[PDB]
Amino acid sequence: KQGPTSVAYVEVNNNSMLNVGKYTLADGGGNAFDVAVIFAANINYDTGTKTAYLHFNENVQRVLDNAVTQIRPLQQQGIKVLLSVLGNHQGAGFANFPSQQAASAFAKQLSDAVAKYGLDGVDFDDAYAEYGNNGTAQPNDSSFVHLVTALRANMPDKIISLYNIGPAASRLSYGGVDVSDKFDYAWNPYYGTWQVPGIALPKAQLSPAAVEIGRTSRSTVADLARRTVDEGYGVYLTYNLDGGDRTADVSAFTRELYGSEAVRT
What we know:
Layout (H helix, E strand, L loop, with lengths): L4 E7 L11 E3 L9 E12 L4 E5 L2 H8 L1 H4 L1 H5 L3 E8 L12 H17 L4 E5 L17 H12 L4 E5 L2 H4 L3 E2 L2 E2 L6 E3 L5 E2 L11 E2 L1 E4 L5 H13 L4 E5 L7 H11 L4 E3 L1
Parallel strand pairs: 1-3, 1-14, 3-5, 5-6, 6-7, 7-10, 10-12, 13-14
Antiparallel strand pairs: 2-15, 3-4, 8-9, 11-13
GO cellular component, one term: extracellular region
Enzyme class: hydrolase
GO molecular function, one term: mannosyl-glycoprotein endo-beta-N-acetylglucosaminidase activity
């Protein structure tokens, strides 16, 4: 199998992670999906102590707790598994940490989660944070730079990704550090569209196409996958794969990226 790295965000609160490893190429080429993303843990806020924390919904906690049965089968098969973190209407967000050490503390909660659950990295989705709630600050210039510098510093061997969205995505430089090269991948967050992320990252690390498996049409999936190769980009963001027979949707993109169709167990 040779071509763009395909990614699949899975809505764990209502779908199994295990569905990602059930699609492989008909040409004996491998998994249709290279990266699977646990969606999602949240950035919450403790108003009384004025500090953000890495929050996990119980349904999310369960995937973690049961990692051997939920995540491991993917990794065993060659699929990398990332945990994504989203704003949670708490005011606290990735472009919000008031100091280096504040960002750094959260940075550790992210690296530890990755260490105890055997994950392959973290993904950042800056949306819904609702900056300003619970008396928090609006987005500032340093926060994100501080948090990514620390995350990268903590886990130099893992993947660190982000959706190209929110205050954080345009707050990559501060001090003498631009955190863009600290990222492995960056993707378009608007499903059904082509929008090349404006971060200083090689084309192979960018995913201008974002699609929703099951909402976005097949001609659109196939055409956006055709365009990823046509333009020289190396990633392909897929979102919301579930437990139904999505072979046709998958083949639509595997045909263009890899020249093969996909079969499902």
